RNA sequence: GGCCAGGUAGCUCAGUUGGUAGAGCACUGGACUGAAAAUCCAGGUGUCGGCGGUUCGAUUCCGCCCCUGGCCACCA
């Protein structure tokens, strides 16, 4: 299979000329300090892909923090080197971030051993990486500027729409690419090849996914949901049974299957109306359904959680038949507003999650009914103009008029004040 | 530097239809006992992190900061 392409016409036609002088500068630099300088990674992918990519990763063969240091001189900005696995980052004024790493053989020899065929150090570096789309390399050093470098396939990888991992472990070594892969299934529409399904079935099953620290799954999480097709990502998380190892009491069934379903036509709905929404909050509302104390603590704490979600949750699971029956019955939106009534907008998400059809049209007008229709005059300060006063009182005769505003009945003002008034008699 | 969480008495911590402060312990004495391991009934605790805003009124609703913890900052 062929290694070696020229994308140095793709390089100056597509990439933006800043990010172009960049890498311009960036090989230069290495042709001075004698470092073989590459870009790698999801850059490489969406340039072939024809997508916007501004993070950019840089790979160069030799000492990273001399590269880095040598190259600080030369452009304005802050470096910041840590000294751990030898890799620097440095800030350009101009706003992007320059993320400089080391290839070298952890053996290798001084001073730099010259080019050897096949370019193994660099190989070295990209077998490491989780997929062949993402394991791809452009040299950037100014003979060879514009060289893809492709040693696994990551090209016909990308004409098909295909996913692989690089070797038979890669989900043992990180399993997060367990999600990530299915993400990238719905990142673009790709499919994941037989024998890393397998080996991802493997890795689930074998419980490799609960090794790894709950705050990366649930990035890769709400990266996840905050793709195109959620939906399609769920259903494929519980085809290789993912869910329930990511939150042993949640247990996948048609009914949630549905559940999930109202849940993700709703969303948008509730992001146009109601504002912005946490879509991870908004899966765990439907996931986390019916959790005892032990599982809830256990779950919130290997990913950190809202202390306070669990409440609206269980107030939800409280709430949704009786809600489901007030819908049923087309009861005044007056007895269907202490529900939602301060209630976040996940909450309603999952309320929503719970229907379709005529209850779904029937709870959005009450929904929006809700949302607007909230005072004009009286309340507070006029009632102390008024025969009431002192505390909690007013307030719920404020609630009275509300609720005989929401049941159809307005008006004016006082005239419903003073019906509220003669049935506190 | 990025992200996710917390701050409630001296300590560890609960508390959402906004509506006047909560539990165990820290803390003392006595009954039984020469004394103790011990249990019994028990004597009062708050700028609810800081500050604006909405409300008659905010620990709560919201925005901006202070502080603590965790994840991450080769691969990721
Ligand atoms: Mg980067």
């Known amino acids: 299979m062929q290694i070696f392409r020229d994308v140095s016409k793709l390089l100056v036609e597509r990439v933006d000329p800043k990010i172009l002088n960049l890498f311009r500068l960036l090989g230069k630099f290495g042709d001075e300090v004698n470092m073989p300088v590459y870009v790698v990674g999801g850059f490489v992918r969406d340039l072939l892909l024809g997508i916007k990519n501004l993070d950019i990763d840089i790979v160069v063969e030799g000492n990273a923090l001399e590269f880095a240091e040598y190259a600080k001189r030369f452009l304005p900005g802050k470096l910041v080197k840590h000294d751990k696995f030898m890799t620097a980052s440095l800030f350009l004024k101009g706003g992007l971030r320059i993320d400089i790493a080391t290839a070298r053989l952890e053996y290798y020899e001084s001073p730099a051993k010259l080019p050897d065929v096949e370019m193994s150090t660099i190989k070295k570096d990209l077998y490491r990486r989780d997929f062949t789309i993402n394991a791809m390399a452009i040299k950037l050093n100014p003979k060879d500027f514009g060289l ?42 790709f499919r994941i090849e037989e024998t890393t399904e397998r080996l991802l079935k493997q890795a689930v099953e074998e419980g490799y996914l609960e090794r790894t620290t709950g705050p990366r799954l649930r990035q890769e999480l709400e990266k996840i949901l905050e793709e195109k097709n959620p939906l399609k990502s769920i259903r494929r998380m519980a085809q290789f049974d993912v869910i329930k190892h990511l939150f042993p009491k949640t247990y996948y069934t048609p009914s949630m299957d549905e559940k999930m379903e109202n849940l993700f036509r709703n969303i948008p709905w509730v992001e146009e109306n109601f504002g912005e929404v946490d879509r991870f909050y908004a899966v765990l509302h439907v996931f986390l359904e019916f959790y005892d104390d032990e599982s809830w603590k256990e779950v919130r704490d290997r990913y950190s959680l809202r202390r306070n979600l669990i409440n609206e949750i269980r107030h939800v699971e409280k709430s949704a038949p009786a809600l489901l029956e007030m819908l049923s019955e087309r009861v005044p939106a007056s007895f269907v507003y202490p529900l939602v009534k301060g209630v976040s907008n996940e909450t309603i998400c999952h309320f929503l999650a719970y229907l379709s059809g005529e209850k779904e049209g029937l709870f959005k007008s009450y929904l929006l009914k809700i949302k607007n229709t909230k005072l004009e005059k009286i309340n507070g300060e ?42 506190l008699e």
């Open 148 to 189: 893809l470098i492709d040693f696994f396939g990551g090209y016909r990888d990308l004409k098909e729409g295909v996913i692989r991992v690089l070797h038979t472990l890669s989900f043992v070594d990180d399993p997060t690419r367990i999600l990530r892969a299915i993400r990238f299934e719905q990142r673009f529409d």
């Open 382 to 423: 006029y009632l102390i103009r008024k025969g009431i006063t002192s505390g909690k009182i007013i307030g719920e005769v404020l609630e009275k008029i509300l609720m005989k505003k929401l049941d159809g009945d307005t008006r004016d003002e006082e005239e419903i004040l003073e019906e509220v008034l003669a049935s």
